[PDB]
Amino acid sequence: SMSVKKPKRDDSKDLALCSMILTEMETHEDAWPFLLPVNLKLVPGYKKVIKKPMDFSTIREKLSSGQYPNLETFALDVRLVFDNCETFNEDDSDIGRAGHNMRKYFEKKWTDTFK
Numbered sequence: 001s002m003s004v005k006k007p008k009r010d011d012s013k014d015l016a017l018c019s020m021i022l023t024e025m026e027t028h029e030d031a032w033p034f035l036l037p038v039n040l041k042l043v044p045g046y047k048k049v050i051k052k053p054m055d056f057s058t059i060r061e062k063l064s065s066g067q068y069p070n071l072e073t074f075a076l077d078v079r080l081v082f083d084n085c086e087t088f089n090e091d092d093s094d095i096g097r098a099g100h101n102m103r104k105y106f107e108k109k110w111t112d113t114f115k
Contacts, residue, residue, distance in 0.1 A: 014071045018063060021109050025078070026056055028105060030098040034081050050088060054080040071114065078106055 025031060037055045040047045059077050061067075068074045085099035 011070070015063075017113055018068070018071060018074045021106070021113065022056065022060060022063060022078075024109060025102065025106060026060070028102065030101050031056065033085065033095045033098050034102065046088065050084050052080060052084070054084065056081065075110065079103075082106075 026035065034056050036057050038046050038050070038053060040053075046053070054077050059074070059081070062077065063074065068077075082099050082103040085095065089096040089099065091097070091100070
């Protein structure tokens, strides 16, 4: 509260570390469904159904231009990618399996880096 602060957790490496994690996700073999925005003119249903589209290129641009205020807003966008994937794709499809694999991969790197 006013004039009463918890000790300062060091955040000065967060930008660099989220960049490294994102590089590892970009280069995973199962990243292909997630590298670019879904083409809303060509994929029926996507526009109306998925209220907040997100993809790795969009996260990389946001990261590069100071649009994440902290590491939690970064994690929120990454999880949005996989949450959208589960909403639109059956678990037993190549893209559905890709999404589960990528979420698992992400969440381990996240815990190992920060927790």
